Design a protein around this nucleic acid. Structure first.
Ligand code: SF4
Length: 207
DNA sequence: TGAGGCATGC
């Protein structure tokens, strides 16, 4: 995968500019641009989503579309300052399809081989940022760091620690904010509450 | 429109 394209540097601007050159999997070809993380190395909370969506791929920034707006409300309800956040995605290029007779770009879940190929960028970000806690937003991100057998619905809101992760941060898994939109509106407010609770667990981690 | 975890299809 991407490991040869990751330069030996902790400068997020250099990593981001290099990601524009990555050939670690096929996603780079149909996407507009790599969407790297956003934030500074002084962040103590890192949050990892699945992939850039349609709006993210057009803007070049993580979490700018509907799921990111919901994440924004979740952050405010958990009293998490954005000054403490570095936010990124497990996969750096937008994976999508279109209906043959349609124009809208329809997001497709990254394959597990794409997550594995792209994980060197995530490791590079984690070493550069040295977060005290990593929030895994959804199954793709959580499995990226915790193994393909990990079930976010089974262990969300738990403070976890694994050995093979650089810097031994606390890890907190939760559901991706888009799941609240995809699921029934009847469950949406309860689901938002659950997200906010998990985020509160993550913000109260003390190294 | 914007998951999750299991199942089936080739
Ligand atoms: S997705 Fe990750 S690994 Fe695949 S190309 Fe874009 S950057 Fe390289």
């Amino acid at each position: 995968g991407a490991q040869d394209f990751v330069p030996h540097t902790a400068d997020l601007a250099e990593l981001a500019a290099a990601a524009g050159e990555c050939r670690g999997c096929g996603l780079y070809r149909d996407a507009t641009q790599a969407v790297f993380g956003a934030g500074g190395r002084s962040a103590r909370i890192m949050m990892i989503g699945e992939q850039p969506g349609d709006k993210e791929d057009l803007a070049g920034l993580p979490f700018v579309g509907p799921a990111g707006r919901l994440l924004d409300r979740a952050l405010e309800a958990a009293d998490i300052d954005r000054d403490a956040l570095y936010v990124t995605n497990a996969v750096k290029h937008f994976k999508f399809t279109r209906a043959a007779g349609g124009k809208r770009r329809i997001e497709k879940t990254p394959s597990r081989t794409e997550v594995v190929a792209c994980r060197p960028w995530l490791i590079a970000e984690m070493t550069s940022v040295e977060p005290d806690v990593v929030v895994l937003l959804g199954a793709t991100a959580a499995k990226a760091l915790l193994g393909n057998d990990f079930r976010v619905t089974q262990h969300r809101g738990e403070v976890l620690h694994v050995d093979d992760v650089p810097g031994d941060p606390a890890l907190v898994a939760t559901v991706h904010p888009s799941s609240l939109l995809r699921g029934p509106k009847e469950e949406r407010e309860s689901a938002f509450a659950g997200l906010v609770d998990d985020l509160r667990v993550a913000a109260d981690v003390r190294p």
